[PDB]
Amino acid sequence: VNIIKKRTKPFKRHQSDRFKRVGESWRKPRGIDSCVRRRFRGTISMPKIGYGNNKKTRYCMPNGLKAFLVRNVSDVELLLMHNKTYAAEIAGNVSARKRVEIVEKARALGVKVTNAG
Amino acid sequence: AAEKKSARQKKRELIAKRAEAYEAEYRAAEREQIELARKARAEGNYFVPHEPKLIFVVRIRGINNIPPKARKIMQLLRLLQINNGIFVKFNKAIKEMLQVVEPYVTYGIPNHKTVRELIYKRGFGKVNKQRIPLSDNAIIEAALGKYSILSVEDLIHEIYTVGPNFKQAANFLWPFKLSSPLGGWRERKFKHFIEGGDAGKRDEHINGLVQKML
Amino acid sequence: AHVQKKNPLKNKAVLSRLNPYAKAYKANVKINSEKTPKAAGEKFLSVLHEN
Amino acid sequence: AQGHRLYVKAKHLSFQRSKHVIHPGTSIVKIEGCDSKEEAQFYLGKRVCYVYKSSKAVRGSKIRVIWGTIARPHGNSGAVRARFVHNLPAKTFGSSLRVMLYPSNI
Amino acid sequence: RGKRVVVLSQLEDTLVVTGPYKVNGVPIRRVNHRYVIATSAPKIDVSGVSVEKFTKAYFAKQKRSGPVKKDEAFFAENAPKNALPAERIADQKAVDAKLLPAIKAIPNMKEYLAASFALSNGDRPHLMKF
Amino acid sequence: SEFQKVVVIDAKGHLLGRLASVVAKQLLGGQKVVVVRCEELNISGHFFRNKLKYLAYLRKACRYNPSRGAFHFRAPSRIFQKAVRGMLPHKTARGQAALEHLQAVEGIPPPFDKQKRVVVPAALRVLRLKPGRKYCTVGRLSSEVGWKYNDIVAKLEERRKVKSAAFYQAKLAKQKKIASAKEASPVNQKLSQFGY
Amino acid sequence: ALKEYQVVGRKVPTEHEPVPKLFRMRLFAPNESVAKSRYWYFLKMINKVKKATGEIVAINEISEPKPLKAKVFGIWIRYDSRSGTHNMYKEFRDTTRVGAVEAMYADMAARHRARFRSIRILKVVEVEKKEDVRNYVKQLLNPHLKFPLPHRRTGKKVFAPHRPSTF
RNA sequence: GUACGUGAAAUUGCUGAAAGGGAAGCAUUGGAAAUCAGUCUUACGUAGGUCAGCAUCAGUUUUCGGGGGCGGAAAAAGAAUAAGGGAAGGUGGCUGUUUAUAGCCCUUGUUGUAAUACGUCCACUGGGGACUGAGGACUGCGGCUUGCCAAGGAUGCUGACAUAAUGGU
RNA sequence: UCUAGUGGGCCAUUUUUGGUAAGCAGAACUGGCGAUGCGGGAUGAACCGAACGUGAGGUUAAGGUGCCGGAAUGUACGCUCAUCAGACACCAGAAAAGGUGUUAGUUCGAACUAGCCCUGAAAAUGGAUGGCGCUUAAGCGUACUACCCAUACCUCACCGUCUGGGUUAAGAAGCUCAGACGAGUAGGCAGGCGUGGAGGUUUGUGACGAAGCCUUGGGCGUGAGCCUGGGUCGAACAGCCUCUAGUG
């Protein structure tokens, strides 16, 4: 089953484009007269549970794997039996020495690394 | 192994012969009406045909702006949605129900083709309060088998001829969920059928409408 | 069981499953076919063609 | 130079739309010489394309093509509905399309 | 495209067809039946030509099963000069020998097969019949 | 039916609105349209009624800077372009591109007097009005609301017609010869089974 | 598309009326349902019968015996207007009673803005003698009738190359 | 670098790019330009990336065509052919008349179990196009003749490209 | 059983009272708006149609198909000529009485009778059948087809909720099957995301760069958010289970 995304564009907060104090992070409009809350035609959409994605393809990368965060070699060995379900993702705070060690650990496991380079 | 296949082989032929008998009954009744009408024309008198005992009602209006009495009656008819069809045993009580909700529904006399294709293409049973399609005779037998209704043809015969178990057969059948009519309605949909609309009683004209929705 | 609803009127195998009678049904039978005995009374025709 | 043009000339009229709401997924196409829905039935299922020219050389080609298929007739005047692999740009309203003679059945 | 060809036989899905190579230079090829407009021109006798050896295996390409391909020498390879088997040339010549007499006998058909079909101004294929 | 790269339309005997509706649709279809002899267009209804309609149109003007308000063009071709403009979505970029695809002119200028001029039967007065109904000419309507080149347009028109008549006789002389030589060839009667 | 229907009906028998009378009507309606409705409409205004206490004993569709013969039909109607005090007699020449009624309905709606509900057809009779015949109908009955073809606007065929001949 | 850890936003200058006919911002769909990841390469004839074409099917649906049963005034007509009746919007003939050197209308017989139209039905049939392929060993209900099957949801035969080609920003 | 919000309403149908009348005041029955998007009536809170999970296909409602504008410059029969015609319900307004205007009727040429047109008809920025325009209409009355399209209907996929049926061979708090369904202010409840501090835990990350910050890089989630590449930076910080609060 190939991965299908019901929606690809983010749900940006209303009027976040016009005001810098208002951020992109989605906030539900509580206004009494809000056009977007009332779902006027032409206004921005709102997050709904109908937009949820297939349970089989949810959390899946386009390659079909799930990026599992990794911080040391023991974190890699947790993916020993799940190398066709998860892909190792080395954390940003891991130094270069363990980054090399995790990469050789993951290549030995056959586990793909999302940010190997 | 072969014991089951032999026993069901017998059961399947019992279904076949009853279906053959039902079709023969349909043909005989149709011929008798034709000959009786022909006799009346030849002798110069008038033969009043049997008034219909079976009625098919389609809900043509949506679920907005409905008086409580009409809304109650349509709920009793299981016409919850627009373009929903039901088979009704026609009597005095039903006649004055359909009189009240006449602005909101249309109805008429179904023919054999209308009943047959409604139950075949849009036939769903109410099995444990669930809408289970009639894709096997086991489904109908497991629900209506206590009334000797074992097959789709038995259910069609009970519905069409208004048998002794018509209430159970009609309530077993889920309210038919018809599509929008191919070709459209008349120009104005919410007048009476008499005054150029499509609401109200329409007698034999319900068959063309049902074939538009099937 | 029954993952897909198949229309028996379009699927001859499903029609065979539900109805073990469509095999031998013989729709078209020549009924009226010996003298075509036209049956219209003279009084019937006069009332029909009256006024 | 009249030994070519195995296609029929057509024009992209508009998207399929109501009075105010457009549906860019399917388009309205006027095929020349097609003046009724009975004539549109012949062009149903034909392969229609939009051919345009670009400065960048994709695979050494200045000409790039968006393909599509005639789906159904539209109206009574011979216009047809067309579905393309990429929805036709809205700037092509009035531009020309090529309707090939394949998949042929004549 | 636009060539006029003579159908030899109907294969599993397509038509094994060739416009006589001495007329319009179209060799024996499979052509899918949805990409041809059959004409009402008088039939050519193809009963005397063998069509059993024109099969899917006959027209089958060489198996590759790998992503490596393409080269200037690769394009210098293939070509009619190379690749093209002598048996394929002999079969083309044999079918030509068995097909030319019929189109010679019926007038105007030899040069008709040589010409190329094209649409002109005002031509409406739905009204036109072939 | 078939689109040409440029279509030249002779507006003589045509109705303003019917022709404008056809022209506006063709312009939106991506077709380049030239309309000549706009002074020969017709408007259904008698002259004084149409004179009153234009005078009512003339009154429309801003109280501040009439140089901002509606600009009332008195030329017959500019009256035609006004009708097409109102039938196009000209505030829209698609509508503007359609407007520059239209060239409406009085008379038949030299880039177009040597080109074929088609007519639109959906807009022809003889086909579209009941006989005995009064109608007016846009050229006369223009001349008595401000247009000042009705005479020069006419005088240039007979000169064009005289030259066109000379061209026709020369072409008809050629067609007489080719027609006479047509039946001389035996093949003309040989290809009679083909319908030609 | 109207149709002529012979509608015969009677009230249901009672102790007071063991043998009710059969009443027949010729009336034009698009279908049998409207035909029965109009029958009950006319029987209700005259003779104390509902649809409920009556019944339609016979329905028949009458076709024209001579649909290929030109005839003159005189139609008496009751016309209801904004004032509603009107009887009319009109004459229409065609080959069938159904067409004459249809042409009457179109003419009556055109000239008087009368609707199907407002008009009730008193009687449709075939006028056979030329002397019995409306001036326009008589002058169609002229033996020497001849006149030019009236204007008839003669695929899309936009942008004609030549000015039409129209003659 | 003391105007000193880190150094955000508002706001500002420079550079690059882009846009602009009396606001701008946004949403939707695609184009263009820039940018970029996945996938692949392999693994074991076997299976395998991306994208297409066609066939055979299944679901849904639209649009044309043919054949047949049945119903009505067992259509009305009409044609052809025998009686009688009447006449004209009066033909040949001589304004007036009664098929003649044109014919028409009405009734009946006949050809007749006439045809067609309309209505209705066929578990009768031929095409064309569109969208969808959910599920994932086996079971089930059926048809055929145990195998097969269009029967409890798409497979088969190929080609091109393995590319920024698809896809994303 | 406990408790929230509410205790300014408004409009329409029909009936009706006060009033000269009112976009006025007051009630009755129902439906609505408030709390409600969508299709349509150019535009509008209550009009018409239809009530809304994310999508694909098909088909309709109301209403429309000259052009703007998707869809017949369709069919049939008439009426109308307007010296500032008419053009679709609510609705954004006009009457008596006439008019050698005209088309049809009724009864004894005369009168009447109707339908359309004109007159009666009359303001102040320039402008409104929505505009352009339209006259055997693209106006009006009737009839009949085809066509266009809503978030409504139908089939299907997916999300969630609820309901029902299985599962001792399956973080049973799991797995599995089926059906119906999905608008929402005030308000109630539930499950989640984020922040500071505390206990436990993870052979947890870190000067080979923690935290923070910048980013036309990538990835995940319906979302709150989360992860990551590159840049800057220089000393600490995090996952999970629980505790807590000056927690968004």
Curated annotation (Swiss-Prot), chain A:
GO terms for molecular function: structural constituent of ribosome. GO terms for cellular component: cytosol; cytosolic large ribosomal subunit; nucleus; preribosome. Keywords: Cytoplasm, Nucleus, Phosphoprotein, Ribonucleoprotein, Ribosomal protein. InterPro entries: Ribosomal_eL32, Ribosomal_eL32_CS, Ribosomal_eL32_sf. SUPFAM superfamilies: Ribosomal protein L32e. It is found in: Cytoplasm; Nucleus. The modification Phosphoserine is found at residue 74. GO terms for biological process: cytoplasmic translation. Belongs to the eukaryotic ribosomal protein eL32 family. Component of the large ribosomal subunit (LSU). Mature yeast ribosomes consist of a small (40S) and a large (60S) subunit. The 40S small subunit contains 1 molecule of ribosomal RNA (18S rRNA) and at least 33 different proteins. The large 60S subunit contains 3 rRNA molecules (25S, 5.8S and 5S rRNA) and at least 46 different proteins. Component of the ribosome, a large ribonucleoprotein complex responsible for the synthesis of proteins in the cell. The small ribosomal subunit (SSU) binds messenger RNAs (mRNAs) and translates the encoded message by selecting cognate aminoacyl-transfer RNA (tRNA) molecules. The large subunit (LSU) contains the ribosomal catalytic site termed the peptidyl transferase center (PTC), which catalyzes the formation of peptide bonds, thereby polymerizing the amino acids delivered by tRNAs into a polypeptide chain. There are 2 genes for eL32 in S.pombe.
UniProtKB/Swiss-Prot annotation, chain D:
This is Large ribosomal subunit protein eL33B. Gene3D superfamilies: translation elongation factor selb, chain A, domain 4. The modification Phosphoserine is found at residue 96. GO terms for cellular component: cytosolic large ribosomal subunit; preribosome. There are 2 genes for eL33 in S.pombe. Belongs to the eukaryotic ribosomal protein eL33 family. Component of the ribosome, a large ribonucleoprotein complex responsible for the synthesis of proteins in the cell. The small ribosomal subunit (SSU) binds messenger RNAs (mRNAs) and translates the encoded message by selecting cognate aminoacyl-transfer RNA (tRNA) molecules. The large subunit (LSU) contains the ribosomal catalytic site termed the peptidyl transferase center (PTC), which catalyzes the formation of peptide bonds, thereby polymerizing the amino acids delivered by tRNAs into a polypeptide chain. It holds the Pfam family Ribosomal_L35Ae. It is found in: Cytoplasm. It comes from the Eukaryota. Keywords: Cytoplasm, Phosphoprotein, Ribonucleoprotein, Ribosomal protein. GO terms for molecular function: structural constituent of ribosome. InterPro entries: Ribosomal_eL33 (IPR001780), Ribosomal_eL33_CS (IPR018266), Ribosomal_eL33_sf (IPR038661), Transl_B-barrel_sf (IPR009000). GO terms for biological process: cytoplasmic translation; ribosomal large subunit biogenesis.
Curated annotation (Swiss-Prot), chain F:
It is found in: Cytoplasm. GO terms for molecular function: mRNA binding; structural constituent of ribosome. This is Large ribosomal subunit protein uL13B. GO terms for biological process: cytoplasmic translation; negative regulation of translation. There are 3 genes for uL13 in S.pombe. It comes from Schizosaccharomyces pombe (strain 972 / ATCC 24843). Component of the ribosome, a large ribonucleoprotein complex responsible for the synthesis of proteins in the cell. The small ribosomal subunit (SSU) binds messenger RNAs (mRNAs) and translates the encoded message by selecting cognate aminoacyl-transfer RNA (tRNA) molecules. The large subunit (LSU) contains the ribosomal catalytic site termed the peptidyl transferase center (PTC), which catalyzes the formation of peptide bonds, thereby polymerizing the amino acids delivered by tRNAs into a polypeptide chain. It comes from the Eukaryota. The gene is rpl1601.
Swiss-Prot record, chain G:
It is found in: Cytoplasm. The keyword Ribonucleoprotein applies. Keywords: Cytoplasm, Ribonucleoprotein, Ribosomal protein. It comes from Schizosaccharomyces pombe (strain 972 / ATCC 24843) (Fission yeast). This is Large ribosomal subunit protein eL20A. One of its GO terms (cellular component) is cytosol. The keyword tRNA processing does not apply. InterPro entries: Ribosomal_eL20, Ribosomal_eL20_dom, Ribosomal_eL20_eukaryotes.
